[PDB]
Amino acid sequence: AMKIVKRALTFEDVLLRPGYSEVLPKEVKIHTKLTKNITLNMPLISAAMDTVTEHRAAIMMARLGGLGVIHKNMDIASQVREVKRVKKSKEYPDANKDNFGRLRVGAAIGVGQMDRVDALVEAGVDVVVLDSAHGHSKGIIDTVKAIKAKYPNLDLIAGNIATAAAAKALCEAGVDAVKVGIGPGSICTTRIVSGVGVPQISAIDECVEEANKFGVPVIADGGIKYSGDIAKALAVGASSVMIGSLLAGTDESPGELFTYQGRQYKSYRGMGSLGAMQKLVPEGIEGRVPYVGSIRSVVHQLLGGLRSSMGYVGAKDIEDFQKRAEFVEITTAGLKESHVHDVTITHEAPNYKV
Amino acid sequence: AMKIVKRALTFEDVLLRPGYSEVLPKEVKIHTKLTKNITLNMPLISAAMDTVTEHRAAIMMARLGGLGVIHKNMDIASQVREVKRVKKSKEYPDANKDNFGRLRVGAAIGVGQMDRVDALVEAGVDVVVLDSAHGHSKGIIDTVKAIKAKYPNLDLIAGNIATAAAAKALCEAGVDAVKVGIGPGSICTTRIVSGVGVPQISAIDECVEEANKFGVPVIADGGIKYSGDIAKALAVGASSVMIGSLLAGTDESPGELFTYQGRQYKSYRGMGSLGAMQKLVPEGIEGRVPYVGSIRSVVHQLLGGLRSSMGYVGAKDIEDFQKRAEFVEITTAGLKESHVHDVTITHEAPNYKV
Amino acid sequence: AMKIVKRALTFEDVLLRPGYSEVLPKEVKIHTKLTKNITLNMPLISAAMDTVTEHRAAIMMARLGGLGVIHKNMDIASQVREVKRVKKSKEYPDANKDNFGRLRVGAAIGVGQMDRVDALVEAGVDVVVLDSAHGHSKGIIDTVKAIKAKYPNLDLIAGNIATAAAAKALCEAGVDAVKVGIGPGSICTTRIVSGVGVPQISAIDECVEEANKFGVPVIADGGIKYSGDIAKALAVGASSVMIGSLLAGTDESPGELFTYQGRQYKSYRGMGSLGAMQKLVPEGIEGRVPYVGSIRSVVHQLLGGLRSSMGYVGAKDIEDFQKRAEFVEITTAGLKESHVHDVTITHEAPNYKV
Amino acid sequence: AMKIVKRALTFEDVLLRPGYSEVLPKEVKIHTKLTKNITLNMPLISAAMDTVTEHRAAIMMARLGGLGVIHKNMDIASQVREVKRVKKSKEYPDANKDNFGRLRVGAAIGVGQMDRVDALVEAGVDVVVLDSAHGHSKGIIDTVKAIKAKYPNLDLIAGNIATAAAAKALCEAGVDAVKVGIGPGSICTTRIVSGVGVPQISAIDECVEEANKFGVPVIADGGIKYSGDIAKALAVGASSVMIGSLLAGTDESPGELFTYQGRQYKSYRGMGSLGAMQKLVPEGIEGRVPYVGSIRSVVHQLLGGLRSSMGYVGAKDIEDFQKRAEFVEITTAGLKESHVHDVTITHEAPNYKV
Numbered sequence A, B, C, D: 001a002m003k004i005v006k007r008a009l010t011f012e013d014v015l016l017r018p019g020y021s022e023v024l025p026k027e028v029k030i031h032t033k034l035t036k037n038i039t040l041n042m043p044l045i046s047a048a049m050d051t052v053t054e055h056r057a058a059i060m061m062a063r064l065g066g067l068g069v070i071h072k073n074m075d076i077a078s079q080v081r082e083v084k085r086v087k088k089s090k091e092y093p094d095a096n097k098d099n100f101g102r103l104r105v106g107a108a109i110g111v112g113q114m115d116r117v118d119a120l121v122e123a124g125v126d127v128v129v130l131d132s133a134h135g136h137s138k139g140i141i142d143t144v145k146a147i148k149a150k151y152p153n154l155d156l157i158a159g160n161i162a163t164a165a166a167a168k169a170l171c172e173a174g175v176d177a178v179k180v181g182i183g184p185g186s187i188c189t190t191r192i193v194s195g196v197g198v199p200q201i202s203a204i205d206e207c208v209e210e211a212n213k214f215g216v217p218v219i220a221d222g223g224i225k226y227s228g229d230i231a232k233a234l235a236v237g238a239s240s241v242m243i244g245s246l247l248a249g250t251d252e253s254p255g256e257l258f259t260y261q262g263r264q265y266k267s268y269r270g271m272g273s274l275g276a277m278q279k280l281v282p283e284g285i286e287g288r289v290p291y292v293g294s295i296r297s298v299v300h301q302l303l304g305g306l307r308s309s310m311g312y313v314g315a316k317d318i319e320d321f322q323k324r325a326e327f328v329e330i331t332t333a334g335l336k337e338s339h340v341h342d343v344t345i346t347h348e349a350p351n352y353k354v
């Protein structure tokens, strides 16, 4: 007999039940925690990818109350430059600011890049995001120990993990948040290339339960296709959500729009695709996503879905949302009924593309 | 661990078992209850949408023994006008009439629109349909209390809900029927935009069980794709069914037919689509449905399927249908076997479009 | 709570396990029982449809050791004529013959058509097939009683049923076989139009268990897409299988081949389609199936699959096949792995069309 | 009631959980056992098919540390010739060699072909692969007995089986490895034609458990679509994997590339297809697969996925991989999330084609 630990679910497998509500969606509060010490005025973080976040995206993210993580596929001096650009930036009331009244920013690092870390810290970065394919490893854990030993009060996010044991090891090493998601990313092939991963909803749930013991927030990273998924991710216990594909088609993301066969697009590619890495064995693809206009407008629709959700559940804030949330498991047939069905769409909605 | 209340099913997940029958389908009775006090000679209600029901559709609906609900996306004086048109309308033996021998009609209202309610009541409307995205809310419940306090004998339908607790709160507030369906509508994106909803078959079953305690009928609204679904909905305990997409392509629905690429259509759109509401965060889309001719002919095929169903089950009437009904859960493979399979359709059937 | 009797499976949901075998497929015996008194040299029956079986198909069926049922969508005098043509027909060693050494034939009848029955009996028909949408009804059961009372030794098949209770009622009325299948037919829309049916594998299993108590064979009718399905149907306990779509494209079936867009076809339609019945509420469609050549060649491939199957299981004959058979339930993913996958077919196989 | 032994899973139904890792993928060891006495420096075997393995493919396979099995669809003298070509062949450090320092090779045989066996043995073949549609049969078992009685120290692989009982019978007869897979092959139609088979992951698991009692390795043959599947197969307990479709499009496989509609391909067909066998009842199809270049490069990507996998699990070698492995069952929705989703691929990856 093979050891099957459980049957794991992801977003399309569950729904939230409506509950008694005394709140309208414009009234709910959506402030949350990025780390033990850093709060967000809204729970969205743009992914640390070279087709998603550099200074322009990071600036808008923080202006809107979230955060951008500057990717690390560039040399130390450039990444420092990108950070300083964000730091040096009534129209944006919910802006997410540091002590100097400057916009907050995150910056990605890898294993054993203490040089990069020194430079980013001196440049005034708010949080360092230590990302790896496998956060549950000696390499990553040694790096956390080295960083916290050298910078005891630097906010450090570490990822990516998918199990409770992984969350424990990272929290015990002293991280300020853990990032969850092995393989759910739109451009990610890890689960297919290696056969390894945990469906995202189950992964978040397992990791939150363990991380809560340390009061360490969980970041749910990857696999968000719609606003409803953000709601579900937050409802199950994640404190924030990290998004790549939904933000890659924006004005502010790196790169320019192009038109192919009468549609507008931008490139979007995984950091583990051959393209991004330049024989290599990739765990990501290079692709394109539809052009969707301003980051502002995209975030507005996403947050509106979250607001709507909390309204349906009766939650006044994210914490209240998490305690009230009840899920129902659905079937393939229920997924179809949930989507648009038996009607051809003639005017596309801003928040639902089929 | 995440709190999963249950695994919920919708229509495509179940079938009715055939049982011993002494009745032919032309002999079964299909009279039912719309509310505590209002009966239907057949269990179909046309949806309160600006692409489905105005006076023409409402008139035909009631003539055929059902009801139409005039939508509320128009000013008070127009909606009053639409109601009066229905009231002022041997060829139609099963017609559904009031005390004056006039056709019955429903008219939709929202939260805190008592002005609209006064006007509709004075115009002689038979039932007011208080619709909201979230019927299980203080807003809706306060409105019910205010309406029943002012008009103790006005038949009031309230919706939409999807849980037993929601049904209890509404029944205790004094409603005459509850309307069930969060997210199953063909043009509805609520479940995707907010992540909230309950698969329709499970939702009806849960709400009926609670509503029965008060002798309050349940209206199953949305997600009907075929005549079989109506049968299933009634069999599980709903007293009537509300239909949008299947009636939107009729002569009688508002709007005109147009031809696109050699097919005939009519527009059909959700009331929560951007189009219908005129930044906004929609929960519906704008679309088109095939043109299907007269309301008469469509209803004939639908009711024929219901009749056939009750025959197979051996039910002499809807009440008997509900007590005899036994379901079987099926699989994806069983759904395929159920549909047409392994043959290409060359002459389309009136009651089955693939 | 809704009364769900069980979770029902159909063919694509199961596989047979291989077992220890001392037999090759050319050595297994495939004789079986059509009814209590009539045996087949092979277990296939062609459906009683006006696009499948008239004299030519029936003749070939019996020559090959099976049976054809002449459809009843024609007047009494014509159907009598078709029967007499079969009766009046070393090249066909396994031929299925009566007392006169004439080919056996079946002929369909409906409720209260005793006139048709007298005429068919006098014409020398071997078995009368009383078919109805709902075999579990007073109409059908009264007809069985009337026929067995008048013709105590006439072999009577009655259908169609899908439950154990239905099988009991028919067996107690004195039928010689029961026919199983509500809604699995390729051209059938009953499950969608009325919401009523039982997935075919579960239906056979339930009915066999009850019918065995009376020593009454079960005929599994409808839903056969491939040779493997025949094997599964027989393995679960059915004594024979009735086939429409797989035989409709043959030389011998009524009608001529035509070519459309470079492919050859024949018409195939349900008896409850509008076309076949000539307002009406159909439970079938009119369609087309690929032209597949001779009945001989089609049956050869089908029987070869059965032979192969019994080989894999180690069965020396159908009875032995039924006692040895063990199933495994599979998943959607297992179904994909089972089919051809990840390769494009360039030369089509005679026994597998994708 | 029908006897359902279990619900069986295949590859797409499971994932491996990540665990704590102190190893990088370039450090894990991938040596394994082909049989009791023959080791591989890497766990891949090319299928014994006339579109996959003759001398050129076999030579490269062994050079890379695996093995090729020369197919038997040719006369004895030719197959002997192919074997001698392999035997007569620092650039290939991991090469898989015999006592003479010559490349190892396998050669396929059928039931009662002792003549072929004598010739292959005298030609110096390293392992004889006795393949049959049904390894669990008197024919196959008698052949094993005859071969081991005549050649007690000749390494004999026998297949194909799918049950624990089949594994027991073969191990007790004295085989050196068993080969597992009834019906999962890309070009295989056995499960559809006969209704018989076991989903590959369940089949391996069941057979390994029994074979381990004898210290007999299990070869998982067929159904491998991606590198992740190899990992999963090894993780569940198989000692090696046999591959057809993934190697059929290589330079080294028999046949030439051709271009059709702007894509490059090679033919790939089952040994039980009509084409390969030349009325016959096939259990395979003739098809085409994309041209993928050198065997070297394909194997590199496959092994890279395995290495990556073991890294994620923390396994230092295959044996350690097997003891650490924990699976999670996923849903259809989880499979979608696992694949690339919601992005159009613009530059294809070498190790992931959609």
Ligand SMILES: C=C(C)c1cccc(C(C)(C)NC(=O)Nc2ccc(Br)cc2)c1
Pocket: A132, A133, A134, A137, A190, A271, A272, A273, A281, A282, A283, A284, D021, D023, D024, D025, D308, D309, D311, D312
């Ligand atoms: C986010 C992922 C998966 C990512 C990002 C960048 C590069 C990569 C590559 C190099 C393709 N894969 C990669 O680094 N995989 C890996 C697997 C297991 C262990 Br232990 C360590 C590393 C992967």
Ligand SMILES: C=C(C)c1cccc(C(C)(C)NC(=O)Nc2ccc(Br)cc2)c1
Pocket: A021, A023, A024, A025, A308, A309, A311, A312, B132, B133, B134, B137, B190, B271, B272, B273, B281, B282, B283, B284
């Ligand atoms: C039927 C629905 C969902 C509908 C109909 C019209 C408009 C809308 C819009 C405005 C898009 N959505 C809407 O009113 N949503 C909503 C969600 C939760 C709570 Br609490 C209150 C309202 C929704």
Ligand SMILES: C=C(C)c1cccc(C(C)(C)NC(=O)Nc2ccc(Br)cc2)c1
Pocket: B021, B023, B024, B025, B308, B309, B311, B312, C132, C133, C134, C137, C190, C271, C272, C273, C281, C282, C283, C284
């Ligand atoms: C095999 C079927 C379903 C069939 C064949 C011919 C005609 C029909 C039609 C007339 C369309 N349907 C039909 O006879 N349906 C039916 C349903 C319940 C009861 Br009780 C009695 C009859 C159905």
Ligand SMILES: C=C(C)c1cccc(C(C)(C)NC(=O)Nc2ccc(Br)cc2)c1
Pocket: C021, C023, C024, C025, C308, C309, C311, C312, D132, D133, D134, D137, D190, D271, D272, D273, D281, D282, D283, D284
């Ligand atoms: C690998 C398979 C299935 C294969 C390979 C070559 C030929 C065949 C053919 C001849 C089509 N099938 C075949 O030999 N089937 C078979 C089934 C049961 C028993 Br017991 C014995 C044999 C099958």
Ligand SMILES: O=c1[nH]cnc2c1ncn2[C@@H]1O[C@H](COP(=O)(O)O)[C@@H](O)[C@H]1O
Pocket: A047, A048, A049, A160, A181, A183, A184, A185, A186, A187, A188, A189, A190, A221, A222, A223, A224, A242, A243, A244, A245, A246, A269, A270, A271, A272, A273, A283, A284, A285
């Ligand atoms: O190439 C890669 N392989 C695997 N995961 C990746 C790769 N590149 C980015 N990711 C992850 O995928 C996330 C984005 O997923 P998305 O929001 O679903 O598009 C990022 O935040 C990373 O965690």
Ligand SMILES: O=c1[nH]cnc2c1ncn2[C@@H]1O[C@H](COP(=O)(O)O)[C@@H](O)[C@H]1O
Pocket: B047, B048, B049, B160, B181, B183, B184, B185, B186, B187, B188, B189, B190, B221, B222, B223, B224, B242, B243, B244, B245, B246, B269, B270, B271, B272, B273, B283, B284, B285
């Ligand atoms: O835009 C909207 N969002 C969500 N539900 C809607 C919207 N508009 C109409 N509905 C519901 O959908 C039902 C029609 O669903 P249908 O019969 O499946 O097409 C209506 O009766 C309403 O209850």
Ligand SMILES: O=c1[nH]cnc2c1ncn2[C@@H]1O[C@H](COP(=O)(O)O)[C@@H](O)[C@H]1O
Pocket: C047, C048, C049, C160, C181, C183, C184, C185, C186, C187, C188, C189, C190, C221, C222, C223, C224, C242, C243, C244, C245, C246, C269, C270, C271, C272, C273, C283, C284, C285
């Ligand atoms: O129109 C109809 N409605 C429902 N079932 C039908 C109809 N016509 C034929 N059938 C059934 O379908 C069977 C053929 O199914 P097939 O072998 O899957 O194509 C016949 O033997 C009948 O039992």
Ligand SMILES: O=c1[nH]cnc2c1ncn2[C@@H]1O[C@H](COP(=O)(O)O)[C@@H](O)[C@H]1O
Pocket: D047, D048, D049, D160, D181, D183, D184, D185, D186, D187, D188, D189, D190, D221, D222, D223, D224, D242, D243, D244, D245, D246, D269, D270, D271, D272, D273, D283, D284, D285
């Ligand atoms: O025609 C056949 N019928 C059934 N299985 C076959 C046939 N030919 C080859 N196989 C099996 O399929 C395997 C290849 O499967 P693949 O790796 O999925 O393409 C071979 O190693 C054989 O075990």
Ligand SMILES: [K+]
Pocket: A337, A338, A339, A340, A341, B183, B184, B185, B186, B187, B188, B189
């Ligand atoms: K919907």
Ligand SMILES: [K+]
Pocket: B337, B338, B339, B340, B341, C183, C184, C185, C186, C187, C188, C189
């Ligand atoms: K069907």
Ligand SMILES: [K+]
Pocket: C337, C338, C339, C340, C341, D183, D184, D185, D186, D187, D188, D189
């Ligand atoms: K297959």
Ligand SMILES: [K+]
Pocket: A183, A184, A185, A186, A187, A188, A189, D337, D338, D339, D340, D341
């Ligand atoms: K993915």
